[PDB]
Amino acid sequence: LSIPSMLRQCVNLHPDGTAFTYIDYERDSEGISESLTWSQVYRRTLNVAAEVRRHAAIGDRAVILAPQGLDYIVAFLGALQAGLIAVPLSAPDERVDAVVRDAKPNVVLTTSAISPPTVAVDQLDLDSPIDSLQTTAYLQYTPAGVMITYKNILANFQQMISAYFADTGAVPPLDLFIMSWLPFYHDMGLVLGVCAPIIVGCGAVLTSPVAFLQRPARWLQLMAREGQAFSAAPNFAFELTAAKAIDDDLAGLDLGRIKTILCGSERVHPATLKRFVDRFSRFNLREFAIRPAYGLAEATVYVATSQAGQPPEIRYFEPHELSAGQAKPCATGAGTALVSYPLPQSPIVRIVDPNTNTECPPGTIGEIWVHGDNVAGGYWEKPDETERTFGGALVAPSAGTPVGPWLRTGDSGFVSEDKFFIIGRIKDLLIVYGRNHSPDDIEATIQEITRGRCAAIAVPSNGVEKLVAIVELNNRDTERLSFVTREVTSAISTSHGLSVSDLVLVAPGSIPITTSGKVRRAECVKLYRHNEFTRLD
Ligand SMILES: CCCCCCCCCCCCCCCC(=O)OP(=O)(O)OC[C@H]1O[C@@H](n2cnc3c(N)ncnc32)[C@H](O)[C@@H]1O
């Protein structure tokens, strides 16, 4: 029923079984380990709940402001245990205090090392020998916090276990262990790192994303520990590992026991997936272990994924018609490549015209709408924004299609042969002469000339959008730069039929990224308009 009730059931069945293991690469370059059994985590969870009962009541919000690590886990788990609506955030910012005022928490859960009462859970006697809600568990973040219920989580996990383990009858192997470096304050990292261990019943090997960025090879190492690994990562993280990994760190590594590596949170590029398998197949990586996965925070986390026992399937479509709005399949190798996503059984996906609230015919591109019990009930204390995002109603629905409520994802997609495809985020698209061009395709054209980071943004000017590209380039003459500017400009002209209004050659690190690495094409637009970039001239 509730995460607290399942944790308590993990303690009954397997008191001394390992639950959470955190590898800390901060002091030692090769990492220091520490593990808790189900008994130890429950005990810390109970102790955090006691200190929280002293400051807040059932229904109050508890903001979690801690670095990655075991203390984050018992802070989050201690909140739900005391019947508080947890609020996972990142440790220090103005957009952190925007949440705090939107959520109005009655307690803050912090660490020594970093009006409402604040608790330092590290300084609490967490190993000292010795209620929950049943609807709203936590908010996932004008800032808008998604309301996630235990019914939301459980339903999504049931949809997940069924799709991810369809070839083994929705039963994961006895060997399974979760491995994640994803941050706990993000959709994927929190459900995979903190919740899945308890709901699934396996242990977790966890670390920080700054440790992965330092040395992306630790990801492969930790996955290859005893058992079958279940992990996840954004697309570019697959790139970063295929690039900056040394066969010396991978000395005598077995990757054949890996069970699932999810690729999600951003567009999945076939080019990136081929590099990953072509490079780590040497160490026995099974390619059907790579599972494209689509989702939103508004759906708890999961919407669709690739078939269980097969490697990712790739489809090909004519690029010219794609911009026109039409998906016309073409021969293998020709046109744009897109990862096929089988239309999910649960939740269900439909492609809808955002202007007429009516479904699109197959091959026609519209907005992705989602329906299912994993879809959240709305945004915390935001009635109007909840109506816009969650109040989707289908006009004259097709046979077998509910009329509502539908979650409007803001993503472009289409169906082709009972498979559906994700083009990209609508507001991030570039419209030029009625055609739609996606930044993921543009940057893929640049990212293969420069092999650095990019961002293809749309700057409005006197009634039209103009293509601007921020191109990170290595800093270590005034020619050579011309060869690159001229190279990329022509590569965008011939591959996309677009003119580059401005190419900003910046130093490495200039483009805004996340902690896991998603390029922030949103800020870039105003950093450009406010002339915040320094060019290599
Ligand atoms: C057995 C143990 C249990 C497993 C536990 C693991 C849990 C994680 C599994 C689900 C992974 C699903 C990605 C989560 C998206 C996210 O990270 O959540 P969120 O931050 O809300 O952003 C969402 C927005 O990102 C874009 N996006 C996301 N996936 C995209 C794609 N495959 N292709 C293209 N675009 C894509 C899209 O635009 C969307 O709207």
Residue numbers in the entry: 4 to 95, 101 to 122, 138 to 153, 160 to 170, 177 to 511, 515 to 575
Give sentences copied directly from the paper behind this entry.
Additional catalytic steps are acylation at the 6- and 6′-positions of SL1278 with two multiple methyl-branched (hydroxy) phthioceranoic acids, most likely through membrane-associated Chp1 to produce fully elaborated SL-1. These multiple methyl-branched (hydroxy) phthioceranoic acids are synthesized by polyketide synthase 2 (Pks2) using an activated fatty acid starter unit provided by fatty acyl AMP ligase FadD23. FadD23 is one of the 34 fatty acid adenylating enzymes (FadDs) in M. tuberculosis. FAALs use a carboxylate substrate and ATP to form acyl-AMP. The full-length M. tb FadD23, containing a large N-terminal domain (1–460) and a small C-terminal domain (473–584), connect by flexible loops and an anti-parallel β-sheet (465–472), was obtained.
To gain insight into substrate recognition, as well as to provide a foundation for designing drugs against M. tuberculosis, our research identified the 2.68 Å crystal structure of M. tb FadD23 complexed with ATP and the 2.25 Å crystal structure with AMP-PNP. FadD23 catalyzed the hydrolysis of ATP and connected AMP with palmitic acid to generate a molecule of AMP-C16. We surmised that it is derived from the E. coli expression system and binds to M. tb FadD23. Therefore, we interpreted these two densities as palmitic acid and hexadecanoyl adenylate (AMP-C16); the statistics and final refinement results are shown in Table 1. The fatty acids or AMP-C16 were bound in the hydrophobic pocket of the N-terminal domain. The backbone oxygen of Ala328 and the -OH groups of Tyr376 formed two hydrogen bonds with N37 of adenosine. The NE2 group of His221 and the Nα of Ala332 were differentially bound to the monophosphate of AMP. The OD1 atom of Asp446 and O38 of the ribose group in adenosine formed a hydrogen bond. His221 is one residue that attached to the oxygen atom of α-phosphate both before and after AMP-C16 formation, gets closed (3.9 Å) to carboxyl group of the fatty acid. The structure of the ATP-FadD23 complex is similar to that of the AMP-PNP complex, with an RMSD of 0.2869 Å.
